[PDB]
Amino acid sequence: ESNFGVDFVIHYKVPAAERDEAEAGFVQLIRALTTVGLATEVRHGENESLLVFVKVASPDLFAKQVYRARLGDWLHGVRVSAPHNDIAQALQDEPVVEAERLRLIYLMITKPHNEGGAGVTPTNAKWKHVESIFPLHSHSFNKEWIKKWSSKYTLEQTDIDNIRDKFGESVAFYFAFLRSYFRFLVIPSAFGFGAWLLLGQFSYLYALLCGLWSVVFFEYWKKQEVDLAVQWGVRGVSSIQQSRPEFEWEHEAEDPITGEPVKVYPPMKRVKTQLLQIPFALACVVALGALIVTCNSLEVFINEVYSGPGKQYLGFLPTIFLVIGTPTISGVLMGAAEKLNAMENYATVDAHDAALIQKQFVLNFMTSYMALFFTAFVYIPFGHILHPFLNFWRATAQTLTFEFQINPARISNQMFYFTVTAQIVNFATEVVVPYIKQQAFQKAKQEDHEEEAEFLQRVREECTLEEYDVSGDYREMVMQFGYVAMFSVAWPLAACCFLVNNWVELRSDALKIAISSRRPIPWRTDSIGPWLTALSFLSWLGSITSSAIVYLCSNSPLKAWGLLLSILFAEHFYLVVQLAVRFVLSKLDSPGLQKERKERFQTKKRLLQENEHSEKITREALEEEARQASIGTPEEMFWQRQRGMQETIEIGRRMIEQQLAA
Amino acid sequence: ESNFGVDFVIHYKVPAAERDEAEAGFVQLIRALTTVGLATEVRHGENESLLVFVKVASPDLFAKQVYRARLGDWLHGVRVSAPHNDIAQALQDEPVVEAERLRLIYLMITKPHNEGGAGVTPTNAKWKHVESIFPLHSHSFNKEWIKKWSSKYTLEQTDIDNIRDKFGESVAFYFAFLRSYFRFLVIPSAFGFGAWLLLGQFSYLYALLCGLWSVVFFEYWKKQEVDLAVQWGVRGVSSIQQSRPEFEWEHEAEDPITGEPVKVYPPMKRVKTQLLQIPFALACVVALGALIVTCNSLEVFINEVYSGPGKQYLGFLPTIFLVIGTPTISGVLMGAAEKLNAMENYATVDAHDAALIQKQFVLNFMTSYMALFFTAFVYIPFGHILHPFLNFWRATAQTLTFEFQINPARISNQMFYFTVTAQIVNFATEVVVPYIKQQAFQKAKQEDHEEEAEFLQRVREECTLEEYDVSGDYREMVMQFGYVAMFSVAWPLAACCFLVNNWVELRSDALKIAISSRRPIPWRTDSIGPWLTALSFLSWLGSITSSAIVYLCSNSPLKAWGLLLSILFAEHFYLVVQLAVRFVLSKLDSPGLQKERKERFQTKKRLLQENEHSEKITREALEEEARQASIGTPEEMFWQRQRGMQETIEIGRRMIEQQLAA
Ligand SMILES: [Ca+2]
Ligand SMILES: [Ca+2]
Ligand SMILES: [Ca+2]
Ligand SMILES: [Ca+2]
């Protein structure tokens, strides 16, 4: 239940074929790891692996790296005040949290020789036998965290701060976003329950309220996010960039900002592959569109038209079949997007991650909302263009076995099906399936001087677990917010159902980092990043889509000017409430920015405190008339008219007398 | 043609009734002015006035104030580097420009005793006899500037920098905005000429092009504006606030940011009068609306219907009468807005100016565009609601003297009339009328030891001139941009005509500061301020209004869905080109921000430069096992397994041998 002081573990898989080359790479690697000053020790692993364990040897060397990294943060404006010296007073002023500690150790093992560490990064360099580097878990803290999170009804800020301290700013920002999104989701849950009973099906007022809620949630999250970035000391990390190791470059250009000159990739090749990404997206659009029109037409055919052979559940099967088939096609599309993003060089890790989020968001947008879009904007207004598909299915079924009545309430059943079906299969695939797969591997598996067998056992089991990426849970929550933003007017209870899911999701991902995945390398982030852009786009499209859906599915016939007027009125109401909420949150005066600028002014004011009259006037005028006497003349005689101030007083008084006389 | 070294002039009008009280105020004032260290001298003026002239006595005291003010700028992040000391090396590094010199002198005469100067501000304090404080002109530089600006075809950057150096950042920002607006107005001038001959009347493509041009001009001006704010060293002055002297307060609260505590006004009274401002605006709306429907209905009646008694020019007179009557009603409305803004306390001068710009922009918006709005959106689509006004005018004219045929080409004549009529009456009222009024006063008017009569003559004539406010010329140019943004599709040549006007306006205001007004007190500004907000709002409304006008006045009948679709398509095209232009200007990498962050990093890197391995690992592990030997035990024995790195090397090699054997 306790680690042995291991800061980091390196796997170093050794293949049997490339044996002695891996031996040479291993000894060169451990020479690099003793060069950087980390105490290292080698242990056996499964499948010809040498799990090496690295910790800080000298706490003075570790505090030296701490001071250097804090200085590098302060040079780029991240830290408000400079660390003074390694007199141990720096650690006494601001203590090193475990997230910062493991981040600086990973920077010592990862950064190249110019920065101050060894480069062991496997993909670019000769260290191909290095499989992965990871920090261990603390099972006592893990059990205490999962018990305290399952016991609590809501989560305090100190739980998010503990998640920060032990897991990094990215995981902390995710759990803070989930907490704030749950506590803001409690509002349209209640109003959707109060608009499903009291108000009619497809109410306009719920659409306008959902637009208002989406705006105020997005802007309040942005304000809370910059407040948290002030509080954790991580504000401004988006400006400093981290170079990517997998970057390949042609030549090297001059230093733009700093002193050292950087490498460059000619961007025309990047624009070439970035225009290559577009036919892939169009092919995904037409493939998913053909699949969804095939499945939806077959579902409509066997449900409404073909009520002969085959029962009702035979009719209900293929849409459920599509929903279960959706993870695999989503997985191969995400793998294709990842390979295409790895195909293009991005010099910074931030631009690489942003392009990856953009591709994954486009793909998950299509595979999440294409069915509801083809239901709302195709099947309801003009389902006569899909009517020859019904004749095609009739003609195939007539040879196989030897009037449409389109209803506007099918979108409600489809939205309810997507909601409960997606959350059930998501909870199944998220936590249940990997846990029972780990139990199956434990049953499949069922020296070291008998002190560490229980420890090296859990280390070898932690080796096999995949690394936890927070982008997936961000993508799940952003897709859920898109559901609430643009399709909750179909099923007004769905937000309420999402509310319940969010509560267990706030524990479920808290379990998934706990026992189902290894500890992620703790990175620092300013914000959630591109998910702000995706969230704002989902809100803006949510207003238009909600009002277009409420007008069309409201249902002498539908007139075009009603649809256009409702869309324009909702979009302008969205812009108006956006300006109003931005104005109020501009006036609300969050405390962290205030305390930041106050402490900065106190620092510069300490630097400030680090740093008769008519006698002086008559003295400098005396030097002026002395310079006149040394040698133009009218201005000097003009200023020598009235040198003394009392002379000006009495001359002004007699001037007032002269103006009195005239 | 040369000043006598006078930094500033104070008028100090003395009324005959309040004589000795003004004498006591005068002597107390000159005691304050010799307390601050300024050499002062009193001269006669007209109408019982004592024009006092103040200059720097000690250049060391002046450089002391220079260093203190530069330090106060650097403490709030305005200056990138601190001024080191008054060793005269500060002036040798960065010289004091004349704008900064006169600004610091005006701060010495204006700021209260806590700041470091005397308070002589007339409105709040007992210094009611003080009329106005102003700096003098330099007639040689003024003549050289007006000759070089009339001779040039375009203006270089160095002319704007000379205007900066001698006149302050506000006047510099205005002339830079006018230059950039002229050089961007040359584009839709040419495209409007090429859309008036080639394309038809009311073309859609010109409306979309005008929207695109308005977006790219606004965003390019914002980028050029932050570049100029970097270059002049005035970036960030919008953050530091200047307290208003006319502020009246109830009590004093704590310090939010700084060390010294500030005074406060209870904001509920401010919200009370800010809700009072709204019935005034509604009354202005209904008054201007009744006036414009009366004038427009009478014009339509005497032109189209009443073609009997009275000629055609009798018919054309009342619209011209309204255009000439528009300055007086605009003047009384601006005076009412100024009195209402003076009624409300604003603690900072910036918030006071912003509220004043907001009120003046609303009023000038109504009195500028109400006629064109009632032409486009009332007279064209349904002019039958104004048809009983025609019967009312017929019934009055039938008793006075003892079928409508609405044409869509009246808006073109009205736009041409507004363009050429407004620019002609604007050039008349701007430069011609005050110059001939000054000539009339010179003919009406037609001691000091006969050295300064020509100088004190020009000083007494400069006393009578009104102070130059840049808000008026900002308002004129923003109204012109609004004309181009939302009504240029009516008359596509108008932008071209505006282009010609802008050229002479770039000299005309350059004459108006020259001979028709006194020198303004040089203030520093970060940006043009609220005119950015008014400009962006005018652009956004310009897209909608241009497309609605092109659809309605295009002209079986007008269908509502066509109007709504055209409005929605143009507004979405506006948002799309807004995102695209913001993306390109985010990628364009302006040089000034780069050089700023580079020089800041070089400063902090100079502060940075102000500030074996396995032996250390084995030494700290030796201390660790010594701490073990002094006295838990499994981790210590684990790390004492393989202390030496070469031991780990050979143990790893035999581990590879063991994995080879199994
Ligand atoms: Ca789940
Ligand atoms: Ca998740
Ligand atoms: Ca003019
Ligand atoms: Ca002007």
Tell me how far apart the alpha carbons of residues A189 and A488 are, in angstroms, rounded to a whole number.
10
- Ligand 4 centre and the CA of B473: distance in Å? 4
Q: Which residues of B touch A611 (CB under 8 A)?
A: 71
Q: How many contacts does A have with B, using Cβ atoms within 8 A? A: 212
By the CB < 8 Å criterion, does A467 face chain B?
Answer: no
Q: Which residues of A touch B42 (CB under 8 A)?
A: 642, 648, 651-652, 655
- The C-alpha of A379 sits at a distance from chain B's nearest C-alpha, in angstroms, of 22
Q: Which helix (H) or strand (E) holds A149?
A: helix A139-151
Ligand with smallest separation from the Cα of A477:
2
Asked whether the beta carbons of A162 and A35 are under 8 A apart, the reply is no
- The C-alpha of B616 sits at a distance from chain A's nearest C-alpha, in angstroms, of 7
Residue in chain B closest to A54 (alpha carbons) equals B639
Facing A42 at nearest CB: one of B74, B613, B651: B651
Name the domain count of chain A.
1
Please name the residues between 51 and 90 in chain B that touch chain A, using a CB distance below 8 Å.
52, 55, 57-59, 61, 71, 74-76, 82
What length does chain A have? 662
- The C-alpha of B40 sits at a distance from chain A's nearest C-alpha, in angstroms, of 7
Asked if the Cβ–Cβ distance from B5 to A635 is below 8 Å, we say yes
Contacts (Cβ under 8 Å, ≥6 apart) of B209: B188, B191, B195
B505 annotated as a binding-site residue? yes
Asked whether the beta carbons of A193 and A226 are under 8 A apart, the reply is no
Q: Which residues of A touch B607 (CB under 8 A)?
A: 82
The two three-digit tokens of residue A235, written as one number: 């504000």
Which residues are registered as beta bridge partners of A264?
Answer: A251
- The C-alpha of B350 sits at a distance from chain A's nearest C-alpha, in angstroms, of 16
By the CB < 8 Å criterion, does B575 face chain A?
Answer: no
- The C-alpha of B295 sits at a distance from chain A's nearest C-alpha, in angstroms, of 33
Contacts (Cβ under 8 Å, ≥6 apart) of B448: B43, B44, B456
Q: Which residue type sits at A69?
A: A
**What is the maximum span of chain B, computed from C-alpha positions, in angstroms?**
128
Q: Quick check: is A74 in a domain?
A: yes
By the CB < 8 Å criterion, does B405 face chain A?
Answer: no
3-state secondary structure B544-586: HHHHHHHHHCCCCCCCHHHHHHHHHHHHHHHHHHHHHHHHHHH
Question: How does DSSP assign B593-628, residue by residue?
Answer: HHHHHHHHHHHHHHHHHH--HHHHHHHHHHHHHHHH
B246 annotated as a binding-site residue? no
Can you say how many angstroms the Cα of residue B333 is from the centroid of all Cα atoms in its chain? 21
Tell me how far apart the alpha carbons of residues A146 and A278 are, in angstroms, rounded to a whole number.
43
The two three-digit tokens of residue B68, written as one number: 């203190």
Closest CA to B478 of B362, B355, B338: B362
Tell me which residue range forms the domain holding A439: 1-611
Asked if the Cβ–Cβ distance from A4 to B635 is below 8 Å, we say yes
Please name the residues between 23 and 42 in chain A that touch chain B, using a CB distance below 8 Å.
23, 26-27, 30-31, 34-42
- The C-alpha of B606 sits at a distance from chain A's nearest C-alpha, in angstroms, of 11
Rg value, chain A, Cα: 34
Tell me how far apart the alpha carbons of residues A484 and B614 are, in angstroms, rounded to a whole number.
59
Facing B567 at nearest CB: one of A568, A613, A655: A568
Asked whether the beta carbons of A78 and A493 are under 8 A apart, the reply is no
Closest CA to A660 of B462, B23, B52, B455: B23
Asked whether the beta carbons of B80 and B600 are under 8 A apart, the reply is yes
Residue in chain B closest to A27 (alpha carbons) equals B649
DSSP state of A49: E
Give Cα separations from A402 to A77, A306, A309, A396, A399 (angstroms): 77, 15, 12, 10, 5
The two three-digit tokens of residue A610, written as one number: 């680090």
Q: Quick check: is A201 in a domain?
A: yes
Contacts (Cβ under 8 Å, ≥6 apart) of B303: B315, B316
Whose tokens are 């689509």? That residue is B381
Residue in chain B closest to A662 (alpha carbons) equals B48
Q: B59-75 and A591-610 helices cross at what angle (nearest 10)?
A: 150
Q: What is the resolution of this structure in A?
A: 3.7
- The C-alpha of B203 sits at a distance from chain A's nearest C-alpha, in angstroms, of 23
Q: Quick check: is B389 in a domain?
A: yes
Asked whether the beta carbons of B52 and B33 are under 8 A apart, the reply is yes
Question: How does DSSP assign A308-376, residue by residue?
Answer: SSS-HHHHHHHHHHHHHHHHHHHHHHHHHHHHHHHHS--SBHHHHHHHHHHHHHHHHHHHHHHHHHHII
Provide the 10 A C-beta neighbour count for residue B452: 18
- Return the percent helix, strand and coil in chain B, to nearest 5: 70, 5, 25
By the CB < 8 Å criterion, does B621 face chain A?
Answer: yes
**B566 exposed, middle or buried (CB, 10 Å; 0-12, 13-18, 19+)?**
buried
Asked if the Cβ–Cβ distance from B649 to A30 is below 8 Å, we say yes
Best of A6, A19, A33, A34 to disrupt the B interface (most B CBs within 10 Å) is: A34
Tell me how far apart the alpha carbons of residues B117 and B114 are, in angstroms, rounded to a whole number.
8
- Return the percent helix, strand and coil in chain A, to nearest 5: 70, 5, 25
Q: Which residues of B touch A138 (CB under 8 A)?
A: none
DSSP reduced 3-state for A11: coil
Q: Quick check: is B85 in a domain?
A: yes
Asked whether the beta carbons of B309 and B401 are under 8 A apart, the reply is yes
Q: Quick check: is A214 in a domain?
A: yes
Q: Which residues of B touch A259 (CB under 8 A)?
A: 602, 605
By the CB < 8 Å criterion, does A17 face chain B?
Answer: no
Asked if the Cβ–Cβ distance from B656 to A14 is below 8 Å, we say yes
Q: Quick check: is B660 in a domain?
A: no
Contacts (Cβ under 8 Å, ≥6 apart) of A351: none
Asked whether the beta carbons of B208 and B570 are under 8 A apart, the reply is yes
B413 annotated as a binding-site residue? no
Asked whether the beta carbons of A546 and A570 are under 8 A apart, the reply is yes
Asked whether the beta carbons of B50 and A648 are under 8 A apart, the reply is no
Q: Quick check: is B155 in a domain?
A: yes
Q: Is the dihedral of CA B485, B489, B494, B499 positive or negative?
A: positive
Best of A586, A645, A650, A658 to disrupt the B interface (most B CBs within 10 Å) is: A645
Q: Quick check: is A638 in a domain?
A: no
Whose tokens are 């006037």? That residue is A617
Tell me how far apart the alpha carbons of residues A605 and A611 are, in angstroms, rounded to a whole number.
10
By the CB < 8 Å criterion, does A641 face chain B?
Answer: yes
Asked if the Cβ–Cβ distance from B608 to A75 is below 8 Å, we say yes
Tell me how far apart the alpha carbons of residues B472 and B467 are, in angstroms, rounded to a whole number.
12
The two three-digit tokens of residue B120, written as one number: 């002589």
